[PDB]
Amino acid sequence: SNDIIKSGLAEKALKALILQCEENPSLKNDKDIHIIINTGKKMGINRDNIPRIIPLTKYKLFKPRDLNILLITKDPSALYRETLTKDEHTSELFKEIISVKNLRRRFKGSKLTQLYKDFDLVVADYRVHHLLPEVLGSRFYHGSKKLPYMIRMSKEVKLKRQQMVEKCDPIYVRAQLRSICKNTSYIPNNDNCLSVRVGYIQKHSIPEILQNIQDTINFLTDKSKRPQGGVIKGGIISIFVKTSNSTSLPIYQF
Amino acid sequence: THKISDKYVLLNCDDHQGLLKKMGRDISEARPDITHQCLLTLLDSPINKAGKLQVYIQTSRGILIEVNPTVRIPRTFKRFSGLMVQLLHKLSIRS
Amino acid sequence: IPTHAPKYEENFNPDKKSDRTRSEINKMKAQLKKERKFTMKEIRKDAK
């Protein structure tokens, strides 16, 4: 934790990784920095392809204006699309707003692949997030680079035996999207290994990346913040900083 | 256009008497210079420059050629023959 | 009316093909295709 932040071994590993990425063209293709956390015991939670948001108090990873954003909505799509286009808060926020049925009708196969090429961030209504794996294809879902997030757009609460009225709240939408872009995410798995993106090579400094790593450690290991946090059991044996192609460089060896 | 041996050439009264005699067609019937000089006269006439003239060529073998009024036929029959060979084999000539 | 000069090649041969290194490489692909097809047919005849 605090020793993991204050250890000069982690900082030296970060300069070593940056220099290796600069020198090696294969690593120069990579642009993202991941940490590999060795949880002491098995996590015991099945993977469900649902990203869980890890807050970053000190710095922001991305701004929503920087990314290309695809919104996937439930399909009386006119209300959501018209509200988000007309409202000035979310007018330029989304690169494309589509419904799940229209997405299934339009994009197939190689068209889906060029969609994945075009769009960097995918967010969707939580009501259609479970339908997304068949529509988006498997080549979105493998690797967890661009897993679609879950946003709730109406702010109303579903009650048993009663309908839920459909509205769109652009302030709530931009708040959730800002949180998603500024904060990092993790997906639980069954075994001990975990992978969390902590920083981007060009846009982040080394103390910023180290502070993001420290915040990630505290959020995951903290007994509170259940159920989004507190998933690591038995402590962290070792963390390994690496890009997509680079080898793992160990920090916080216990 | 006919193939020699390998050179594709437009058949001529003056330069291809042996080929015309071998194929059996009379040498006096192989006159593309008349078409050449008629094209020169028509395209150089002032009605063409005024834009009120159109030219079609109807060959003896049944080929129909449309001549855009903006074309400039080369003044020399050698270059005309090369242009006609490429036109008859490629079906069009651009600018 | 405007006058446009025609674009034609002197000594035109329809059989012969009309940068240059890429054209040589493309001719090499054509040769590769012919050789592969011929060897396939020969191998199949020997097999039968």
Binding site: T247, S248 | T76, R79 | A5
Partner: peptide, 27 residues
Amino acid sequence: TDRFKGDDDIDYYQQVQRGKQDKKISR
């Protein structure tokens, strides 16, 4: 344009990597 002109003529990285490698070889 042409008026009877005629047609124109033609550091730490390799140590950690070798450590993983010779650890596998040692096993």
